Amino acid sequence: LITQLCDAGQLADYVGLGWLNAVSSQPYLVQALGLQPPPRRVDVDAAFRDAKGLHGHQPWVATPLPGQTVRALFIGINYYGTSAALSGCCNDVKQMLATLQKKGLPINEAVILVDEDNFPGRTDQPTRDNIVRYMAWLVKDAKPGDVLFFHYSGHGTQCKSRKYDQCIAPVDFQKSGCIVDDDIHKLLFSRLPEKVRLTAVFDCAHSGSIMDLPFTYVCSGGEQASGTPHMKRIREGNDVLGDVMMISGCADEQTSADVSTGAGGAATQCITCMLMNNQSLSYGKLLIETRDMLKRKRFKQVPQLSASKAIDLDQTFSLTEMFSVDRSIQ
After folding, report:
1. Residue 43 and residue 15: Cα distance in Å, rounded?
2. Which of 61, 158, 226, 282 could disulfide-pair with 164, CB 3.0 to 4.6 Å?
3. From residue 105, how far is each of 12, 63, 110, 147, 275 by CA, in Å?
4. Cα(178)–Cα(141) distance, rounded to whole angstroms?
5. b/e map of 149-170 (b: 16 or more CB within 10 Å)?
6. At what angle do helices 283-296 and 266-276 cross, to 10 degrees?
């Protein structure tokens, strides 16, 4: 890792560009994309082949973690100039980058796929083919102790099969089709070895996908700081060896007593809030705090944490550590 600003010249100061404190952290509008035609399913072999030439860059200087390397992929898509246009997804990536910089995550290599022009550090356009190959890039070199970070802000929708699948929409989905959640799970999760940690944040207002992960916890309205939350199993079987954690937003599962909000940006506010809390709180306590923040800011969604193992929610939240397993969950 580069540990001095004289080593490779000046690096980005995303905090200094106002990306932590001077951009909107409010909900933004996300109109549902219609049902899409069948996608082109991913050939994982081709993806990993097309990834061998690829590389990221070190986005800032930070203190390196002994025995660990950090890699990150950020995808933000505004679909400029189309009926799919969204105002806040590239801004979500801005906030994610500035928060990681502020908290000093020592990223060795980052790839930034955004469709915003003049975006410092942008690697390439978030097309179907770039998303696929850079997803493979993120996981391809992973060795014990490694830490991977993934963030997507853009449309989530449904697509037909050759009944419907959940999917994400690349910037060129009109020409190239979407990427189904099964394929994302295969690219990002299924090829991790043991002892590698990944955190994946999906900010999709209109897909409830948890990327096929076996355990989940929704921090709904009736949860309290003086309760003891646990994850639950929602799928039989598991093909993930690594420690994958996913943050997304979903509908509150508490039934309302009823007898304005915004849909875009919740998952990004959730993870950035979690990181900006400076107190080394547990997953469980921290999710309560973020739930309260989301409600206060008029987001529609509550936090949803999903994982490849039943995480003991008394464990301290981090992006870098392997999970302590809740043995009470089969």
Report:
1. 38
2. 158
3. 14, 8, 11, 10, 10
4. 26
5. bbbbbbbbbbbeeeeebbbbbb
6. 130
Distance, CA of 34 to CA of 143 (rounded, Å): 40
Residues 148 and 199: their CA atoms lie apart, in Å, by 6
CA angle 166, 86, 27 (to 5 degrees): 90
Q: Which amino acid appears at position 26 of this protein?
A: Q
CA distance 262 to 132: 29
DSSP state of 43: -
Query: What are the Cα distances from residue 106, in Å, to 140, 147, 281?
Result: 19, 10, 21
Give start and end residues of each alpha helix (H) in 141-224.
173-176, 181-184
Angle between helices 266-276 and 89-102 (to 10 degrees): 10
Structure tokens at 22: 């001077």
The CA-based angle 48-206-240, given to 5 degrees, is 40
Q: String of b and e for 313-328 (b: at least 16 CB within 10 Å)?
A: bebebbbeebbeebee
Specify the pairing of strand 179-180 against strand 243-250.
unpaired
Token pair for 35: 């049902």
Do 103 and 142 touch, CB atoms closer than 8 A? no
Residue 92 tokens read as: 């979500």
Are 95 and 76 in contact by the 8 Å Cβ rule? The answer is no
Domain boundaries, the chain: 1-330
β-partners of residue 168 are 156, 179
